[model samples]
Target: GRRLRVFVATLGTETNSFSPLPTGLDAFRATMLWRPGEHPDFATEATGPLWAARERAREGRYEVIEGTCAFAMPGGPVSAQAYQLLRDEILDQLRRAMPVDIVAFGLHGAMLAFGEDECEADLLERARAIVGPDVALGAELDLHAHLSQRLVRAADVLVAFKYYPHIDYVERARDLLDLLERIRAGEIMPTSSLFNCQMVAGLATQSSPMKELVADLFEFERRGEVLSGSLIQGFRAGDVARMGSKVLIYTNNDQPAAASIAQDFGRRYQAMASERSFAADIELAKAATAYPVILVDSSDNPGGGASGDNMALARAMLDNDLVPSCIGPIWDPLAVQLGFEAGLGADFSLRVGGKVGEASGLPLDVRGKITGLAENVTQNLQGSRPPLGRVVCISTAGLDIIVSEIRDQCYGPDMFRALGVEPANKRYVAVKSSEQWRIGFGDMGRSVIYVASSQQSSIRHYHKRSRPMWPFEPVLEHHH
Candidate 1:
């Protein structure tokens, strides 16, 4: 038998239609935009699966061809030009690498282009057109993806990371490769079934209900002929018709079994959501009572496509006279540039943050000393490497504030340590992130408090999203 031929590529970003920032080619270039064989030595969400494919191919059973790898941070709709350029590049690469047995894609299913509401489905459809029906198609997605029927129909197998913070990027990649190999060997006919849960909320798998549910999913995969199970929580920031939770199950040559399991899990999950505890914002001063507490500004979380420049938490901390408190990495290129020019020990006055829109709050004026400065700093959160370009740590009003030229969420202690600030020593550490920070700062604190602010990514702005979302509505007449 001829060796299996596989082509792999990745291109997508979680899109928030409400975000004022429009993602373009510059955004992709600033973050991670690599050609074939140009990816970093480290395994990333996009490249990890490709690496797995390469490793499997090395066993002499398969041959792998690499394609463009592109991903930008979660933001507004991707610019038409950037989307077209990236889509054309990937499609052209697939065309050149024809006669392949399988094509694997790593995509964020919530992506929305300027004119395309369902970017992932559109891309998969185009790729399907290139590969033809006989060739197997597979894809890996973040759990925060919007599960659309078009997406499910385009690919033979679709696997989503089980964890919320997504610590299992490499594991999920391996799973995708294994499924593709099984399909190539004619051992399993993978079939997917999607069941809309009629809900839309971020559920953290680190805790109860969700944690147990994730375990159950794993158990299902171990039983019978079940190949994979996924709970796609769906990206709430995407204001599209397909914006909601879904229960996806893949089984080996068992479409009926997959559908039954998917529906059962979906109904079970919907019941759990009835009593779900929502993370509520708290008073900064009150939260400070717990020394070494982590203040999570989820509303301004750049990971979820909000402008990470909200100063509400910082302003509140300052007003409450919280000393030795640290808050960062604030997304303000102008402030970072000014701090860099001020030099060490130099005192400079500047207005920071609130440069995006009303969701970012008013810029706070501060006279602070530039204590530390660095360029091209990278912080590793699981397998993802988020770059903090030209970071400047300014100590003002008894607080250490980190400003960065790049807009990224604070995921790890290295983001602070990279600028000479120790998070362990601070009375309170404010991070502009959602749940991902819990992976890094969960064990490094006395307590963690999630503080909500007026931002574009807030769930309170559900009215801005597709109507009739769970908890927001008594009943959704039509979903899935």
Candidate 2:
């Protein structure tokens, strides 16, 4: 009849092996770095579990013990030192909160650090070691996760956001804690298994097949067919060994059932095999002719560890003379600083984009007028506030380009509204985002155009890996 003592924390960020920006301590500080007991009262991608646990504490049924929660924007691997610092901090916090009944985390399952295997699995293993296998453990993860066997072996339950736009993190965190509490009650024993889909590609859950699959997953859990099921839409930007779509299923005390159920789900996923669309007809000029169109600069999506500073789309907009067109949060702190120092209403010559190397396209020089300077800006990712550092709008020709000191995607039209430009007034609205923007900008425009590479991208070389990944290793087959 005693209250369950639950430890809550987070340490997460997607890592791009090819990214130019380093994920250091400042990266964590810039986005989120909460000390034990100091998390904000709100929920975010990486701290939603902590928020849910706090709410559970208020219900007088669970006592919440907080831990350090650190997160960075998707970028290069967390410097080996930075990862060590946070990993140790949270581990020490767990030691301090001895005799806890549950340990739950809000973790990005794709986090990779220099000199480390998958960051989350390592953290999970350490937690399991500290708890000595009795305390219940679980985590809420981004759907774009790489589910390593180590992690599956380390925790009681691992729940990832079910949707790609990921509007369900807060709810998924609740699910994690709910299952964790049940595990603590000795009412359920979760057996987990990973069934590989053998493909590394985007599964746009908003669309059918994938959409229907997610619905079935929810229904399956609801009907007690499984304890929980997760479609780990493995992050492909990183050169990880386990990079691919994997069906993760948990059955109440049944390994055979979990793996068998995973196989049942995995085959259904294969029905849509190799189905990611690489649109070839993204003619900016033609698309711009259609009024109020949304253009997605897919390769530059910051949410996927991209620089968000690719000039390819901006160049196309300029070359096509897509009048009244807009694109941004281009991750250029220098341009934003120039705009800020010039103050509002000033004219200046600016070199924009191309700050990061390789994946970041070349910079372009243009004469611009400072339209607006936004201090303290945030974009809505569902209800979560995506931190957009200081922002500036530079008007050149008929284009109003938004720039941010922060490396982030243009999640919504608010990024434009903050700069005195209405997205509806523009013929073309280009956002440097992969999919999360759909949650924020779903209804703002009529037609949607995705400008992406028609050719298969060259795979990033990895020094270490667990298995042969797909597209690169086209012959990669079933590993069951």
Candidate 3:
């Protein structure tokens, strides 16, 4: 038996059309830019699938060629220059490692460039052209990705993470490897069918309808003929042509069956999504009465490609005089620098957050004492270590605010404890995240209140959406 040869690479970011922040090379540099063999010992969201593939290849008598691994924090459209640079690097690596049997890709499906509508499709098309028709190409995407026909046509296999908090990266990667092995052995001829749900919303898998929906997908995948099944909730912040929820299923040479399954589940999920009511903005003071209350500022969630510096919740807390509370980790590089300058125990006054745009609100000028400072810190969320850069903890306005040099979402409780703020002791905790925070902080809070603040990720900007989707559109013209 000939040794299997596999080439792996990654390059993507979740793009938010409304955000003012443009993703450049610096963005990838700040988050992750591992050249060929320089990947960390542990697996990250972008590289984990490749690592899993590598593990499977080693055990199955295969050779793995690792390529460039680049991913930026979720932000606005990627600069054309930076996109070209990274895309060309991946292509060049693929060219150098020619005649490979398999090409595995780790990608975020919501990426957009200056002129490109479906960046992932473009990359896959280029990769297909390079590798020719005989080679098998597979990609693992973040479930928030916008699924397109072009992407479906270009790749042989596509799999997405099942969980919303996305704790199943490794498991999804393993699934990709299993599919590739089965394809190589001629055990299955994979055919994918996509069903557009015609709706755009955040469907967290931790809850009722979504939980049941995810369970159904898993059940379908367990069938002998079904290769895989996925539900892409689609990133609402990404105003692209394919920015809508979709159901994707792969079957063994059974296109009609795949289409049937996709349509049925897609319609059911869309109905559930349209009928669901989202978390609304509430009185911060009244909600704070419930101790250990988690105020989720979803509108400003950096994880969803918004500037994490929105001061609306912070200002609201201050205006209401909420006490013994903590809100963080706010993306304020300047405030963090000032805190470092003042050092611990030094009192200083500075303006924090709200520097991005009108949606971010005005910067709050607060006088506080720097209580804790940590350099090169990271938050471990579901096995992914997201760098927080330098973190500065400040006690101000009856609140403990965590300031970060890097613009990052608060994924776990460690982000607070690492900065010397005990979350359990605080009466209120504000997290700049849409849904991922729930996995880590869900147990710590008495109640979770989702706040609809003025930020880039807000669903209120319906005018910016390119497609006519449900909720945004009362009646959507559905097409499979």
Candidate 4:
């Protein structure tokens, strides 16, 4: 009879247990920090529901209360104090907006703080406690998430990005809202089930078995019993006990069907697993075959909480004499500062990368000419425009190096162009990203080559993990 009351907030980041970087208040401030009622009138990665709720409110169908929405770039464990401050603030705000029919969150399911191993589950559990059993709880998660039982048990509906490059948050957010409304109006009864895939690795949904699987996943939702389905391709860098792949299914009033479907898809995914490995020679060979090849530095992806300062890949390219190539978003603030001060056309001796630790490799020392400098550059992340603060481009030894004052994963070619290098003109373009580059460079590239360095540890090195996973153990049973 009355407007549907909804409360929304977002707090998340991917955490790398092996990384040396700390995700603190400053990190969130650099990324996203909007207090209650202070969020922008637009969309972002996980907080799309905040925008969606407001849009529905405009149609006089919902009453919305926006709470703290904080995000940090992927890094090592988030500081305990920073996590507590944000967690408490959102909870306090939720208390004030009590009696709401819906509570939705935008969360990175793999988040780990200094003291907390299951950040997403803990947050949702507390929110569910506050909202009680009646309110319909929902969350929009990044595909790179750690699926915990507490998280699945605490929420009525959970939806994660279906694609690896993740270009569907806005649409998924809408789906979350529509589902919540249906539950509130007694139109659907949502129950969730998960199938533990017992594996942790990247599944570039744009390619291979994952591509066809992603398509079938969407098609399965059209079936009568399914409400929402997602493949939570667990973040490998999150070194928690339960960090592994899972398939989540929310079926309408059919728990058995949901459980069966989840198991089916989980087995399908387990078989689809391919070795997402990297070799310098193989990558260089691919580059030689193509005019303009994009080499993905999966090992040092800042998005997965790598230091973004590894020079191993860069050194390989240099040794191989991959000329007319550009390497970028190398998380070197000091070098960028020096470049800004030196200005364009200035030549200087620079030592870049290897700032984080031994895993980043030794810094490369060379004479560099400042090719370009830009401040507060923005890049298209799917549909969002997050700032890439102050950038400096340096040209040395046939490689144009792009450095950023802020640490972030390379998402778009705009980062290349922002520093005065056109990505289209380069023969070998190396980016410090896992797979998100495909979203921006898919149409422009001649070939996509995956490359990485041994500076980063493999999944086998994740000792804190639970579950007898595949490739790591040679065999694993379907665990739920």
Taking the candidates one at a time, how many backbone clashes does each contain? 0, 0, 0, 0
- Cα lDDT tens digits, model 4, 1-480, are 788899999999988888888889999988889898778776788688898888888998889988999998888889999999999899889889997999889888888998898788788888988998788888999988888888887688888898767779878888998888788778999877888877776678888889998888898887655899999888777778868889998888888999999988888998887734346444554447666888788778887777888877677777778768899888888888888888899999888888987678788875889998898887888578767689888898879988887777778788888888998888888889887776688787777777746543533367688757755675534433
| Quality of model 3 by C-alpha lDDT | 0.83
Error of 4 at 241 (Å): 1.8
Query: What does the lDDT read for residue 90 in candidate 4?
Result: 92
Clashing pairs in 1: none
Which of the two candidates, 2 or 4, achieves a greater TM-score against the reference?
2
- Assess each prediction's global lDDT (C-alpha) against the native: 0.83, 0.83, 0.83, 0.82
Q: How many backbone clashes does candidate 1 have?
A: 0
Error of 3 at 114 (Å): 1.5
> RMSD, each candidate, Å?
3.2, 2.8, 3.0, 2.9
TM-score of each candidate structure, all chains considered together? 0.90, 0.91, 0.90, 0.90
149: Cα error in model 3, Å: 0.8
Worst 10 residues of 4 by lDDT: 452-461
Error of 1 at 98 (Å): 1.4
